[model samples]
Target: AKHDVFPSFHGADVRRTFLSHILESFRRKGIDTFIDNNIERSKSIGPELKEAIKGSKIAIVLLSRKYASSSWCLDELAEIMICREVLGQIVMTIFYEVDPTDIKKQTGEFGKAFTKTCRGKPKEQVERWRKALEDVATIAGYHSHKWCDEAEMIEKISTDVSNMLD
Candidate 1:
């Protein structure tokens, strides 16, 4: 596939920050990637995204401060989780100012946002998102809060991603 990596992120918060930096790093390293920052472009994702997520060899999920607020982001993460399990795809998660425990159990501000989004959504689908989050939390990933140097963090991320590529 032309796409070596698929990044699932909430662009409203992280796009201008960590996301753009890492994207530039990937470009320097020649890691072809796909990113959709237009959160308001559409309400829900379709088959095209499913294929996009699955086509990638690596999936990087950036769980930001307000990640749970967007059902679109949640849907993308859910699909990435599925691809990781069923297709043996590599999954890399980053806690971008958010905590993994909050994502796992849906607590704190992240949980609050999740609850609000799930309010009118279907029970079955919500559970799917929850389970996907739980799975992501378990896999050891990068935590921006702990990283004192953001540049080093991005460097490490892109380096690790490059190592994982081939």
Candidate 2:
């Protein structure tokens, strides 16, 4: 539980842009962070990644437009929520170019993506993803469009995480 942060995001969406800056900021601040950078996408969240999540003290989830499109992201979110409930892991969400309302109510693109992704999947699994989305949306977090400057938003996040760690 000593790792400073476990960052979960749709890499294709923000890995080069928002995520890069965020990760760099964390590194500048000496935050120990874990980010999955596998070249090949795994159908499931592997044991190593799950253990990393379990060991991390805080999880920062970046909810983007295509986030729900990938079952991998949904599975990660579910696991993160479970860690929050069972192990007191701190979970922070960043609504990156996506509406918090969409996440909470599973509306708009979030709805479409989940519907498509969950097609033929078990009902219980779909419900778990929905519940995870709803739960994380309820927590106080950042919205990308709400900030005029991305740097400002990143700084605010860095400060908050640093403070939380202290």
TM-score computed on alpha carbons, candidate 2: 0.96
Q: Would you estimate the TM-scores of all the predictions?
A: 0.95, 0.96
Top-lDDT structure, candidate number: 2
Q: How many backbone clashes does candidate 2 have?
A: 0
Give the residue spans of candidate 2 off by over 4 A: none
- C-alpha displacement of 132 in model 1, angstroms? 0.8
Off by over 4 Å in 1: 37-40
State the weakest 10-residue window (summed lDDT) of model 2: 35-44
The per-prediction CA RMSD against the true structure, in angstroms, equals: 1.3, 1.0
* Model 1, C-alpha of 83: deviation from truth (Å): 0.6
Give the C-alpha miss distance for residue 12 in model 1, angstroms: 1.1
Q: Per-residue lDDT for 34 in model 2?
A: 88
Summarize candidate 1's per-residue lDDT along 7-51 as a digit string, tens digits.
988888888877989999999988889866473356779878889
